[PDB]
């Protein structure tokens with residue numbers, strides 16, 4: 058796209074200029090710190106769903122809703138045919154990180170929970186946290202309506218006071234919304250990702266947050282502006298270096314568009330069905346492994 | 350410089366592509382959201398202390414130590430003759446924001462307190478919080494000491510659960526550290542600043558974090574790498590426009606240098622005299638009016 062390309066070039070930079078870092082998850086990876094952020098116009102309904110490799114947008118949409126509901130149980134993504142949180146939730150893994158009395162499938166006070174109940178005291182993923190902690194999302198929405206120029210529209214998942222309790226620390230830790238009014242519309246979003254996995258990570262989150270912006274934009278009666286991905290520890294797994302170059306030689310197809318609704322009116326009232334993506338023409342999928 | 354010059358461009362870019370916006374503090378501005386982050390090298394003892402305008406380095410130093418100590422009382426900073434917090438702590442401001450039962454000078458759970466006592470239950474800037482909350486700064490130094498390639502070296506002041514109790518929401522909300530070991534050194538730092546005042550702010554913060562970075566690198570035996578300033582709502586106050594083209598025309602003098610200590614080894618044991626800044630050759634100073 059020149060959008061997705063800009064991303065590809067980064068997939069090459071981290072390769073021809075990456076850094077050999079011994080990885081804690083125990084794996085060989087190349088990495089670059091704080092490279093130049095990736096921008097994606099969200100205009101004309103365009104949705105930045107990378108074409109150079111089938112992205113699991115089905116899990117993306119499903120996981121975002123899981124986030125907004127403030128749910129922290131992987132079992133719920135399992136009940137919907139999504140196993141992206143099975144590992145960091147395996148009874149085995151919980152133990153490795155000391156969470157032994159924590160029941161399986163309970164990811165701790167991750168993303169969503171912080172999004173809607175920040176300060177709230179976490180205690181089991183099956184409890185109802187209505188009224189507890191601070192609801193960033195609701196606030197963000199409320200503000201954008203009230204006074205849209207606010208410079209404090211911050212959605213975060215990074216709670217240092219609740220880290221150990223988490224099955225995995227907030228990877229994409231927070232984002233700041235901004236709305237430029239014409240000379241009203243243009244809801245932009247710049248998020249900060251501390252650790253970025255270009256192969257499976259970045260793409261998924263690009264779409265993940267592009268929707269977020271679209272959803273919140275939609276509900277606030279705004280147009281999505283652009284989306285800029287800011288990354289810190291950007292990295293690539295060696296066991297994929299080759300499975301990235303063949304991709305790099307691939308020509309990026311134009312991004313599809315996203316059509317929200319049929320007057321869905323709540324944000325907390327979105328369903329897999331209320332999201333419509335048209336003209337997605339990606340290349341042949343590639344089984345992406347990883348590490349933990 | 351081209352370091353400072355890059356900054357200068359950004360200042361003109363805002364003037365040319367800036368957006369007329371109603372400022373909350375009250376007075377008019379021009380803002381650009383998500384501009385390309387400024388990088389500054391700390392390589393070879395260089396210190397990004399802008400030269401096209403005298404910078405309150407002393408203000409900068411005293412305030413960092415103040416931060417580190419986890420102090421939240423402006424009065425302290427006043428006993429040292431700094432007045433940068435006298436406003437947002439004035440009796441008149443506190444009430445405008447509702448903290449009508451807050452004794453003047455009590456900024457609340459801001460930067461410092463969050464850095465060393467995050468989870469802690471703040472209450473009165475004269476109380477002893479020793480061992481309360483999460484001591485991010487301490488945990489960061491430590492992880493860097495043990496496992497330096499940690500993708501989780503985050504220091505943040507943004508606590509959604511405390512924002513109201515604060516005299517002002519964190520501006521330079523957070524930063525992640527990263528260390529590139531050779532074939533060890535390089536302690537680079539990337540901070541996200543939701544609201545950047547290219548006028549006074551940014552410059553002051555480039556120094557503020559440039560030092561924090563050096564300082565920590567110092568106690569970890571590492572050498573600094575570079576500094577990356579990422580910014581959200583980057584802007585300018587009209588009442589300083591004409592006041593900028595004048596500066597936009599000055600030729601940036603090369604940055605001075607920073608040599609820390611005499612083996613100060615803790616980050617908790619620093620003082621003005623431990624900071625020697627060789628070769629700071631800025632142009633005369635420019636009186637700029639804030640905006641509460």
Ligand SMILES: C#CCN(Cc1ccc2[nH]c(N)nc(=O)c2c1)c1ccc(C(=O)N[C@H](CCC(=O)O)C(=O)O)cc1
Nearest residue numbers: 374403404405406408433546549550553554639640641
């Ligand atoms: C960064 C930061 C923290 N801050 C705090 C802080 C608090 C409220 C604000 N409010 C507004 N409207 N804009 C700001 O940028 C701002 C900054 C100077 C004062 C304060 C901060 C100054 O006066 N700096 C001197 C000039 C005056 C002097 O010599 O004393 C300088 O030259 O640096 C930064 C710089």
Ligand SMILES: O=c1ccn([C@H]2C[C@H](O)[C@@H](COP(=O)(O)O)O2)c(=O)[nH]1
Nearest residue numbers: 226228229252253254258259500501
């Ligand atoms: O949305 C996500 C979630 C996880 N990760 C990756 C980043 C790192 O490779 C590892 C997390 O590292 P630490 O939690 O140890 O910091 O998982 C991503 O890239 N994107």
Ligand SMILES: O=c1ccn([C@H]2C[C@H](O)[C@@H](COP(=O)(O)O)O2)c(=O)[nH]1
Nearest residue numbers: 208209373518520544545546550554
């Ligand atoms: O280091 C700093 C401290 C904050 N400010 C400014 C930014 C805004 O001018 C104001 C904060 O705007 P609010 O989001 O608080 O309204 O304080 C800076 O630019 N730099």
